[PDB]
Design a protein around this ligand. Structure first.
Ligand SMILES: [Mg+2]
Ligand SMILES: [Mg+2]
Ligand SMILES: [Mg+2]
Ligand SMILES: [Mg+2]
Ligand SMILES: [Mg+2]
Ligand SMILES: [Mg+2]
Lengths: 347, 348, 340, 346, 345
């Protein structure tokens, strides 16, 4: 559930909010211009000595559900208790804030499942401190595999650079996965559009509503993305070096594009709703045309079949040619008049 | 009633605007690192000597309809009459004012009844004087109760800091109450969207309008809340210690999140109204399809029934070789043609 | 169209009076006199004095007053330019303010705006009004009976009191607008009719005009509070803040009302559409349980030479044994989707 | 209208539809002097470039491009700027050079016939102490500025050509305000029409203005840019003391944008109110249909059933069958119209 | 897209235009010009070291061999070649110390079938040559070719950076043409929705919404690219050419605002459609209600005067048959007068 409430606990408390409390691993990669070393341990105690390592280090504490390790890394790295609560509070808007000793950033990673329409969000909270980058996640597996491979095989300029470029690389991988997610959302948009244009029913409206809810969730998560990246570029904290400052513009620009795309998607969804409305109105019109064309034809027609079919005794219209087929010509000509009327009106 | 009737009065006058005039209680907790003292009383002159106590003190004055007590406190602790009238002006938007002696902050704490759809509010006014926090409410029933627990249980870090951290703790309790209220409203929105898409009714639009109006009122109350926390965060007077500023930043971020949630809720309900319109249009269209089918299959056949049967003489009928059943057969054939045409059109 | 001409733009030219009350701690002296000469000495009164020039249709009185008190001719033109927005200007010796008094009338959903001009002189306050009828009665009542602290404090507090009375009247107008909005909500939910939609649009226009008038008002009070010219004493800056705060509240309220009205019309649409749905069901459940039965009644009405009408149970009732039953069947159909 | 192809940027071809008129006028004003000229030749206006005092030189009827070319090469103006001057269907924009500032804006003419709007390019070039202004047709909205120069009102004479450009832009903004007043009159008329007498063609009008409003945005929103650059950049050609005046004009442009946006919102509301009124009116028509069908269809039911051929009718000649039929008619009809009164349909 | 999981160094032609291949070279100096078309790379290579400006247009990049050859000879990075061959991407601008890499998309829009088709054109500005790559045969750079051939304008006097400017100017001019075409389409759909609302109107307005989405998605990167071009002032671009790039940037801003206004207009088109269809449903309602009012009571009257039981005012009660016809006519006249008062048809 949304479960926005922690129910008034003291701010210094560290309590986990998410339901992802199965797997806990720590993956550490210390990479220098010439030396790379990686190790995966569940004991944070062997990871904590790398706080003061001169070479850049990427530490990954998967499964923040174990609050003991988060409290311990906060105790060493000088992380504020509020920042640690923000680590654990996975229902926290993405935000960036700069301290005298570290830069603390909160992002969301979105995943989309095919054959269904549901966004699943995983909070990734990362702190750049003393040429090291701590990452805090709640599920094994993430979107930073390209960064891992690049660090492993000396690809790109990441190896020649410090922890600021590691910050940039991680945020860049996350924004790239947002582009992948928006591609999936665009595919869903196209499917729903062809569905509404080709066959509208009573379930396409709930499909459109679910897609619109997904889009508003995306907006609520992505505008804080823009704020975060703008703050990362606009004004340079001492932790971030100028050499890597232009690189942030890249991801910042990317975020802007994402917003635009998401905004556009929103518009499309509204139009989809609109077109459905149009459909039913037009569909309504068609139906009534039939209900009119029959009526205007047969409601008067039966009239004659009534007005010349009463129980009147010795009525004058009796005799004539014969009495029965003389009126049928009138019936046919008035029906043809109605048919021509609705043909020239194109109904 | 929710009507602004402080007009026709001098600005220094103090008149209570709201409706809760039932209970009047004074709760005092003077807490320190070592020991704390609690004091429930109904005489203000007992709580006056707490102004100059060095240890931080918290004075909850509920039921501010007792204007005499508020005037006495304003005279003693040294609060301007405008601030007192704003305390007693229930329809005062949340705000913050940094005076030289104190800081005065008006917030609104809400109550949502799930069974009904009306959302109620009351005003909480906090005055911080570098040694004490005077907070005024309208009635008993609070959200600050967990805060009291900390004071009574030495829990957390509240008992180690000054009165500015107490202001923090109360404001954070209010923001947590707001988060609870948004959870309740989100549940209401889920129920409303389920009813809109599933079973449109006449009362559905009324409930949707009530929810939209409640969300608009909530937004009107929350944007001043964000402004207040921005004021408490970005630039601080000497009243708030530098140690308390990051905590106020936390509360500012919380209020930002709440405002974003309210905006998303407003967009969702605005979409929901049009979704309901489309659904009722579609149901109306299906009813019209039923009507059109029945009309096309029974009115022309009524015209055949009218052709046969008048007052007349000498049409091709001569018992027409028992032609009545074949007349019915032709009638049924026409009906079958109509129904298969509509099945091809997929109207059935 | 001279750049500095003094022409009464407004249309209220039916009444004229002058009300001067020189008030202080010791004593208040109040009078009303059509002659403008009696106004002139109070220019140089040390104690605060309030001069209300009701009716600006006579440009002679407005001119004479401005020329003797030192008001620039262009400021006098702005006074006589009724069709104007709320404004604030600061000079060396006087502060010029233009605000609007709003009147809301029932049974005719319109706003009547009367431009009021306030000039602060550090020794007196000059008020120019379009016509008899002002929202400042609490202020003059306060001055008369020594209520509040208005008598003790100087003309700055007098200007604050007048602007506060204006803002309180704006609150009254907003309360009336809220009552109208509640009535419109009830009407659109229950009795849409036709005049409701035009009243909704008229109230939308009223709120547009109110916002267009109030946002300059909040700018004026922001100017009066954020920067304090030597005319306004420092001791009176907090009081202006209150008015400013009130104005902010007012603006918020207007926006809220706007939002509500923005929904109302849409809600109306939904409501009336739902009404149509019922009119569908009533027409359908009555055009499908009778017309097939009208057909059944017409089947055996075919007067033929041969007919199987000769059958068991004599004539008539034998049809109904199915006929009415068919109607019952129809009900079941509706009962399986709640079309009733 | 944007087809300008097969032409290098240096080509100077006029785009608009006005070619009848051509005049050139000069106002050479100082803090004591004033000179007014009005001719149709470039030789008279040419030597005014080197005048120390501010010189406002206006060219109406820019269709004859050779005068624009002559003032282009004589004043050291890029041929691109000359083409932009002749390019009528070009958005308003301000460009700063090391010598001159070229700002292009639009003047709007609105008259009540057909509820249509027209635009005219006006292009200013501030060069040292000269203002080259170009416009397509005779007549403009700088008559207040002309009177201010002629009769030495205000502080325009005391200042440089920077304040002259300020006054020109402020006059354009004031004309935009008059435009917005006329537009508001038009939406008031349309509101009265839709609220009082909705018609089939009203939608056209209800959308016509809407389209026009969007068009105004396509011109008004660029102005928000061009005045912003007139104070944010504040290049040395524009004096430092002139910036607050451009701040005031920028605020006026923001005000224009707010007014045009709320006008568009009112027009959208007019579309919504028309749709609501049409829905209510068709609802009323179906109400008439529903009462007639409901109260006359069971009447046809009883008429068919008691007037239907049977071998042995139980009624036959039982009693006064015709009064009985009329009585049951009346009973059910009054019952069902009371039902309709309860539903308030009739 | 077509490529998935490939390492970021592979040269694949993602596009679907493989019909035609040709290479045209136009080498122009302020003195003379020389143009020739072929399908070989050997006669294209020598122009790299020629000081005089040259324009080498590779029409048809389905041949990865030729693109690789010219890229590796002209000092173009394999990544840039991959970007050239990668069709489905945003317009890009990249600055290298010896060449400037630009990716733009030129559109073609046909009135008969309302579907705009994109073609990625890629420009590489070296110190003395402009290397252009196109997807298929056909472009809008014909005016630039004419200027080169007939010395029109100042293109021949200037350097190759002015040629890059001229090509981008031609592309934005084609954008203006296509904006005009869609403006005409929007006007046609405005009329059709306003007075002749049908299903095809809704299908076409959704198609226009999608097409305008694609247009803005491709034009905002165009604005960013030209902004970079005239503000970054790279050493490849001369300072004398920057005003031309600024002019093209103004053109692109105008295109962007026009596209946004078109989007707003088309968005309002759907509301206008709902209003018009509601009006049409209202007038059909009117027709049905008029017919019902003027015939259903008359059928009832005929039924109740056609009852088969005996007791009835029959046998010409003062000519009863014209009496009932007169009563029916009076009822019909009352109904039609009431509806004329109601202003119905
Ligand atoms: Mg907390
Ligand atoms: Mg937090
Ligand atoms: Mg008979
Ligand atoms: Mg007051
Ligand atoms: Mg019969
Ligand atoms: Mg050109």
């Amino acid at each position: 559930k949304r479960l926005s409430a922690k129910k008034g606990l003291p701010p210094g408390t560290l309590v986990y909010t998410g339901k992802y409390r199965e797997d806990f691993e720590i993956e550490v990669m210390n990479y220098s211009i010439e030396e790379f070393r990686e190790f995966k341990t569940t004991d944070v105690e062997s990871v904590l000595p790398f706080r003061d390592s001169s070479t850049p280090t990427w530490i990954n504490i998967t499964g923040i559900h174990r609050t003991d390790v988060v409290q311990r890394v906060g105790e060493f790295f000088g992380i504020h208790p509020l920042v640690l609560e923000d680590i654990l509070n996975v229902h926290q808007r993405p935000k960036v804030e700069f301290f005298e000793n570290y830069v603390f950033i909160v992002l969301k990673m979105f995943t989309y499942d095919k054959n269904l329409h549901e966004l699943e969000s995983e909070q990734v909270s990362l702190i750049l401190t003393k040429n090291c980058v701590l990452m805090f996640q709640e599920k094994i597996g993430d979107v930073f595999d390209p960064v891992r491979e690049r660090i492993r095989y000396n690809r790109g300029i990441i190896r020649k650079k410090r922890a600021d470029y590691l910050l940039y690389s991680l945020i860049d991988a996350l924004v790239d996965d947002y582009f992948v997610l928006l591609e999936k959302i665009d595919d869903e948009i196209d499917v729903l559009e062809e569905e509404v244009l080709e066959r509208p029913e009573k379930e396409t409206v709930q499909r459109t509503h679910q897609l619109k809810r997904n889009l508003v969730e995306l907006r609520k998560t992505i505008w804080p993305l823009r704020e975060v990246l703008s703050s990362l570029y606009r004004d340079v904290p001492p932790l971030i070096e100028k050499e890597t400052v232009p690189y942030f513009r890249d991801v910042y620009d990317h975020t802007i594009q994402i917003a635009d795309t998401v905004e556009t998607f929103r518009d499309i969804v509204s139009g989809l709703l609109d077109v459905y409305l149009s459909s039913v109105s037009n569909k309504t019109n068609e139906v009534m045309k039939v209900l009119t064309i029959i009526a205007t034809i047969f409601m008067p027609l039966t009239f004659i079949a009534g007005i010349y079919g009463m129980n009147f005794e010795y009525m004058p219209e009796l005799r004539w040619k014969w009495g029965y087929p003389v009126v049928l010509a009138v019936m046919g000509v008035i029906a043809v008049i109605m048919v021509v009327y609705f043909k020239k009106k194109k109904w």
